[PDB]
Amino acid sequence: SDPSSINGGIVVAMTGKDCVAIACDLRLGSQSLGVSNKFEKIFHYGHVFLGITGLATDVTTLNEMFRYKTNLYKLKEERAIEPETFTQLVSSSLYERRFGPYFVGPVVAGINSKSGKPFIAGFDLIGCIDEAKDFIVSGTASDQLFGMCESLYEPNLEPEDLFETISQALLNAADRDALSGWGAVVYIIKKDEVVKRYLKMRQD
Template sequence: MRERLWRLNKVEKEFQNPYKGNVASLAMLPTAPHTVNVTIHLIGPSVFGCSQHIRVMSSPFSINGGACVAMVGKDCVAIACDLRLGLQSLTVSNNFPKVFNYGDVYLGLTGLATDVATVSDLFRYKVNMYRLREERNIAPSTFANLVSSSLYEKRFGPFFVSPVVAGLDPKTGKPFICGFDSIGCIDFAKDFIVAGTASDQLFGTCEGLWEPDLEPEDLFETISQALLNAVDRDALSGWGAHVYIIEKDKVTKRLLKGRQD
């Protein structure tokens, strides 16, 4: 029995921490990365004698609100946006269009209103330079790559916008739509693309109403009903809409009047 206890003590000493009591050696101990979860509860008045209020900053994409949707039809394409400009729940204007024309291509921009204005002017300049250099209008697929590369240039300080591109290919006449995130990742689609604060509602209405190979008038009715019913369920968008129906030989722009509340 004594021999067994002696062996146990010997093993314990052999495995004893060699750095024990040595402060300099403790600093040399290998450390593994670990995560610490800290929960802070603020109760009662602050050190200045006033109550503490925690204010959560909202996303820049939802400050001004807005909604945009593009749909594919039979040899045609449609893009629509709402007209509201807000400061969260405060409506500032009901005439703030978010679809911009660049020759044969249309660009919808939702997000922070200041960035919407900046980005639309930036692409106006770049498309004009392309037209002067190439002596032709920019194609939708080329414009999509231009948007993607331009947004990726600012990836470390991105524009808070969600672009949507729509148009017809000048050679084949096939509809082209795509969407982007704020740093230029392209999302190609063959049915519809949505963006803005009402995107969740737009996904539901578009999936329920869209059908393949819609004629221009049917496409207009579908995109109009999808947008109006979606923005009626979103407090940060609405107040009417602009709808563009793009065909091979013409572009039809229509104004929709929605709920004004």
């Protein structure tokens, strides 16, 4: 009935020293029934990463919409969109559906190609921006992720340390949520290399 908890799933983003991490579970369900264990919720437009939790049809629609808009941006601007600018575009796009919104919890992660500054942001379903220094959480286990992140997180973690922190934050949060899990992906993002790791976790 509640659109934001039909399909389930989580995204978490964290900042480290000259790096950002964004991670998601792989579950898509119809409430109690698990349908797919290969539903990735993290997309990228150039060097800008977008995680989307919530109603799966809207996750797919918004991915297609932001690919569309960042493709036209690049052709006209003659450069890849930056995290700060994309954040404003996500906000703008969500608030134009103010009274018929997409049932999503988007998360932006990336490094500004010019300044080198790590950037993360989160949004409510109508585009209000949460620009936290530390971490952003979204999805059916957002309470669990807040709990994990608030204790596990410390600032200026090295990429390979940040990987362990965000991984343990996602895994243990997902294992306390019925509608999250069935596998997990972690992106470790540096200024000019991105590593993608699939985590081993319980499949119940």
